[PDB]
Every structure is written in C-alpha cells, then in structure tokens.
Write a protein that binds this ligand. Sequence first.
Ligand code: CLA
Ligand SMILES: CC(=O)O[C@H]1CC(C)(C)C(=C=C/C(C)=C/C=C/C(C)=C/C=C/C=C(C)/C=C/C=C(\C)C(=O)C[C@@]23O[C@]2(C)C[C@@H](O)CC3(C)C)[C@](C)(O)C1
Ligand SMILES: CC1=C(C#C/C(C)=C/C=C/C(C)=C/C=C/C=C(C)/C=C/C=C(C)/C=C/[C@@]23O[C@]2(C)C[C@@H](O)CC3(C)C)C(C)(C)C[C@H](O)C1
Lengths: 169, 164, 34, 164, 65
Amino acid sequence: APPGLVGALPPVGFFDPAGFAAKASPEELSRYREVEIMHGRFAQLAVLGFIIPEKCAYDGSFGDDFLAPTGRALEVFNTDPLWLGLTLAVISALETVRLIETEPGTRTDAKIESLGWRPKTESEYINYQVRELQQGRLAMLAFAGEVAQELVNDKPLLVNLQDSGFVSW
Amino acid sequence: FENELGVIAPTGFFDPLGFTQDIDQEKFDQYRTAELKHGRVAQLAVVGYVVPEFFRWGFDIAPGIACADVPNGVAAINAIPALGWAQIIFAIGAVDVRGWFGNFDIGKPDLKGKEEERALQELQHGRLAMLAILELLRHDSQNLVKPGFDGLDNLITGLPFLYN
Amino acid sequence: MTASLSNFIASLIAGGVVVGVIAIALIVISKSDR
Amino acid sequence: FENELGVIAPTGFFDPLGLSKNISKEKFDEYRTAELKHGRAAMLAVLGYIAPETYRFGFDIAPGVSTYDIPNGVAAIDYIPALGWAQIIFLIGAVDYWGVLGDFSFGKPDLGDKEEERKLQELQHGRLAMLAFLELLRHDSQNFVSPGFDGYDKMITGLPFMYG
Amino acid sequence: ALRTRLGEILRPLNAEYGKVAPGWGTTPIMGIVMLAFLIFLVIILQIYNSSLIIENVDVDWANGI
Ligand code: CLA
Ligand SMILES: CC(=O)O[C@H]1CC(C)(C)C(=C=C/C(C)=C/C=C/C(C)=C/C=C/C=C(C)/C=C/C=C(\C)C(=O)C[C@@]23O[C@]2(C)C[C@@H](O)CC3(C)C)[C@](C)(O)C1
Ligand SMILES: CC1=C(C#C/C(C)=C/C=C/C(C)=C/C=C/C=C(C)/C=C/C=C(C)/C=C/[C@@]23O[C@]2(C)C[C@@H](O)CC3(C)C)C(C)(C)C[C@H](O)C1
C-alpha cells in the first residue's frame, strides 16, 4: 500500500484509514512527511518541558511562586506573559532562518552532520528515522492529552496522578 | 556480526549505538562472554532474592549472626563480616577463572538438535533477569536510604503472597 | 526563581531576539544582492 | 628449567619437592607469574603493616568510620564495611586482569644491560618479603586471638625505636 | 644546535608547528562557550550589584568566624 515512506511498523502496519496517501501528489506526500517530522520534534520538546518545570514546582525547588496558583505549566500565561511572548518571538526568528535557508522538500535537514553523531551503516539509519517518527507521534498524543487534562481540572500532571489514586507516592 | 546467536524478534539486531561497528571476532567474543556471565549472575540473583523470603538455611554464617536473622535485600552486605564476604568472593573467582568445582562432565548434556535454540533461550532469559535485578536493587536501596519514597511496602513487591 | 531572575532571563531572551532579527535581516539582503 | 632466571649462590636451583619436573614451559611461565605477583604483593604488605603504626592518613573510609581509630593488621578488616572492601577488591582486579591504571608506558624503563639483573633482584626481594609477611601475620593473628601470647605485646617488634 | 638532554625530552611538544585544521574547525563550540561565559559574567555582576536578588544570597558582610 505505501509508496516507500520509511514509516509503517509491526504494531499496526500502514495506518491510513481516511485515504490521504492515495489522493495526494508526489510532492504532497513529501510535505505530509515533513509536517509529521516537525510536529513530532516540537511536541517531544514540549512534553519534556511540561514534565520538568511542573515537577520542579512539586518539589519546592524553584521557590514558592514558580507556577504560583496551581503549578500548571499553562499558568505562565498569567505569571510572566511577556517572557512567553519573547520566547515565541525568538523561536519565530530562528524558524524564519529555517524558512529562508532550507528549500522546499528539505525543511528537516539542519546540515548538522559533524556537529553530532549518526549511525554508520544504512539499515540502522532507516531504523533511526522510524524511531524519530514514532517518538514524535507519541509525543503529539501526549501533549494534546496534557493540555486538555490541565484545562479540564486545574491541577498538575503528577498531582492528578497522586490524587485519584493512580500512583503510590 | 549481524548473524550470530542473539538475533531474535522483535528487534532483529539491537546495536543502536554502534558498538559492533569496527571490531574483530575477539572483541565480540569478549562481549558475548560478558553478556552470558552477566545474565547467569542476574538470574541466580533474582532467585536468591525470592527464596530467602520463605526459607533460610539452618547454619550460622559468621561467628554469631546466624543465617535466620540477616536482612534480605541490599543489606546483608553490611551484616556479614567482611572476611567472610571476601572469602566467598575469592571462591566464586576460583570457580570463575580456574573453573574448578564448576566443570563436571555431567553438566554438559547432549542437547540433541536443539542446541542453538537453547543457547538463544538462555541468553534471552539472561537479558530479562538483568532488568529484573536492576528493578529489585533500585526498589530496595531507595526504600532503605529513605524508608518509603515509593509507597510500595515490602521487598518483593509483586508477589504479595509471601507477605513481603 | 524570584521576580528578578525571571526578569533577567527575559532580558536575555530580548537580547537574543534583537540579535536574531538583525541577523535575519542581514541574511535576507546579503543573499538577494550578491 | 635449571637455567631460567632465578638461580643465585645460596641454594642454586631450589626445587626440593620436585614441583617443577616434567612441567611444560607454559606452566613454568604461570608459576613465575604467580611468584612475581605474590612477591610484589608481599613487599607492599610488609610495608603496609609498618606505616600505620606511626601515621594514619586521615580520611573516612566509610560513612562513620575514620582511618584514625581502626586498629592495624588482621583487625582493620572487620572494621571497614564489606561493601567498601568489595569495591576495592574489584578495582584491584581491574588493574590486574584488564590492565588499567597500571600500564603507563613511561613506568616501564629500559634497563638495557641490566634487565637480567634487576629482575633477579626483584624476585629475590619478593622471596624474602613473602616470609616477612608470613611472620608478621603469625605474630599479628596469634596475638589478636589470645592477647599477650609470645609476650612481645607490640607489633613491629624488631623496630623498637618506632614504639610499635 | 646544542642538543641538550632536556631538549631531547621536550622536543615532541614543539615538534609540530603551523599545523591547522581546515574549514572552521570547532569554532561554533567556541561561540557557545563564549556566550555561556557572558551569561555567567552578567549573572555574577548583577548579583554583586544587588540588581539580581536571589534567595539565600545577601551581599553583605557575614560572620564566617
Ligand atoms: C576474586 C574473585 C573473582 C575473580 C578472580 C574473577 C575473575 C573474572 N571475572 Mg568475575 N565475578 C566474581 C568474582 C571474581 N571474578 C563475583 C563474585 C561476581 C559476582 C557474581 C563476578 C561477576 C563477573 C561478571 C559479571 C563478569 C566477570 C568477569 C571476570 C573476568 C575478568 C573481569 C574481572 O574480574 O575484572 C573485574 C573488572 C571490573 C571493571 C570490575 C567491575 C566492577 C563492577 C562494575 C562494580 C562492582 C560492584 C561492587 C564492587 C561489587 C558488589 C557485589 C558483591 C558484594 C557481590 C575474570 C575471569 C567478566 C568476564 O568474564 O569477561 C568480561 C564479566 O563480565 N565476573
Ligand atoms: C545537536 C547536534 O549537533 O546533534 C544532535 C542531533 C540530534 C538528532 C538532534 C540528537 C538527538 C536526538 C534527540 C534530541 C532525541 C530526543 C528525543 C526525545 C526528547 C523524545 C521524547 C519523547 C517523549 C515522549 C514520547 C513523551 C511521552 C509521554 C507520554 C507518553 C505520556 O503519557 C505523558 C503523560 O502526560 C500524559 C499524556 C498523561 C499524563 O496524565 C501522564 C503522563 C505525564 C505520563 C543529538 C543526539 O542530541 C545530537
Ligand atoms: C596489607 C594488608 C593486608 C594484607 C595483605 C596481604 C595481601 C598479604 C599477603 C600475604 C602473602 C601474599 C603471603 C604469601 C606467602 C607465600 C609464601 C610464604 C610462599 C612460600 C614458598 C616457600 C616458602 C617455598 C617454596 C619452595 O621451597 C619449596 C617448598 C620447594 C622448592 O622446590 C620450590 C620452592 C622454592 C618454591 C590485609 C591483611 C588484607 C589487611 C591489612 O590491614 C592490610
């Protein structure tokens, strides 16, 4: 069914119930894959960002005002809004650098070849691409869930776990 | 080295961080020896954690002490005199390097046909036991440094029948 | 993490965005004007 | 084997019990390796049984114990906790089997036209040091069991000026 | 000219001269490190200036004795 995209794994297979990777063009599928990779990268970072500041609030490690009322990371919109604005601005600037340099079709290769490590063979690479994609998918789901849950009952993740009797700490 | 005992589903060849990239057969043989020995030790260690929870020997390790008073987990490395621990260590070493009270020919059965399958099974069990021994060590040591810190009481938390 | 520390790190980010916008402007022109 | 290194004038070839007849050169290599290692360790012993009698380092070996109070000799063992002893034993082994922290090439000199004379000096010193350690252990242990035995209450009896 | 014994020992240290890596080498790490050093310096300067107030750090004479 698929056209050679490195994705697709044993748990399910080629997951495409709605029929999008048959009604698209050769360039459209490339853009879809890029969209996937990028969303995943951001998400993964955002999940780690939700976890660590919130925990540092739970452990009294940043003072008694860090995420003041509850401890939710969605509370930065109340305490320090301009900091969040400037951070989104810096992200936007570096991503404008991306949009300028990278050309249509790439938009994912940061040319970070020597600055980091990489698998030496070729099969392992295919595996690492599949991994990046899978971690990104799981992170997308996790971020959506965290945001929805916190907007439902204003309460941090670890505390929502502690209450309601889902952990043992 | 993509075809050597240890390749089993789901993960075909689990060398993600490129360790078998540029190595000769000697180094991979050393790695396999370390893996097999580690696995065997881990399996014996897990069995050792479980069994003293419902049975203790009838002798008296160390001058006093007695085998039925010693704590069960990460402790008992500080409740047995150091000389006895050193002697046990060196005896295990004698069995390890010299291979002494550990090579009896009645210990190498004729695995008619099934040799590779049984080698693969032994390696896989070693892997599982290595992870299990890590979990047991973490739970015990953490709940020893600060009683609690996990909520889960008891040392072998998982088999509640032993009431421990 | 007091008010002073938050303001300090936010100032660091403001410096970052200023340098970033200057660099982005330089990259755009320099290229479109070989 | 009556021409290999290790023959001096008092007792030229020492082998009364015939422990080196019919052996292959591989073994005699292993035997010489054991002799050299034991000799070096015995020298370091006969030097570590003396130094603490007038100079204790100062640090804390374990969380509560101080190397200012632990008695010297076959008594310090049961003071340092068994985990610390083990953590040492394994590091000494790391230096002994994998040859780490002990193979720095600038420690191996070029004895030139003396490499057959300094090796013999090393071996003979080791032979003497082994017997010295035997005597020190005898005195130490015999008095640690029954205090006052042999009458010479001190440790390094032969060096009275130290005030053992 | 006048090879001395010391000179023989120290020769390898000065042996290679003018050797260089091509193509920007490890310059970006130098940039990262310089920036982090600048951040550290402004942190220290603003703490000492009392322009950055942190819990448990009072810039005043204390009783060490
Ligand atoms: C004096 C006794 C003795 C001797 C001579 C040997 C000899 C050997 N062992 Mg060995 N071993 C012993 C006791 C001994 N063992 C005991 C009691 C255990 C625990 C079951 C093991 C577990 C063991 C494993 C798992 C492996 C060896 C390996 C080896 C071989 C070389 C590596 C080595 O020992 O350097 C030691 C070098 C080190 C760097 C030591 C590592 C220290 C670890 C990481 C942490 C130490 C934790 C702490 C100090 C000990 C707590 C446990 C203790 C209280 C029981 C060699 C044949 C290795 C092998 O066959 O080839 C690779 C190998 O993989 N041994
Ligand atoms: C820099 C350079 O030069 O080279 C670089 C190149 C390159 C490639 C960038 C490098 C890399 C790789 C990197 C950085 C890889 C990073 C990968 C990363 C960071 C992957 C995160 C996954 C997180 C997940 C899946 C979250 C799960 C979370 C899940 C599934 C949850 O359930 C969360 C949860 O909330 C729910 C939803 C409900 C809550 O009630 C309960 C909890 C809280 C449990 C290197 C090695 O750095 C070198
Ligand atoms: C330093 C220190 C410690 C220590 C220690 C250590 C490691 C001490 C080590 C002691 C050690 C290593 C003692 C070896 C003796 C070997 C001997 C005597 C060999 C004799 C061999 C003899 C006498 C002769 C043999 C033969 O002549 C025969 C019989 C016939 C001939 O044909 C052949 C030859 C010539 C070979 C403690 C205790 C751990 C704690 C303390 O706090 C600090």
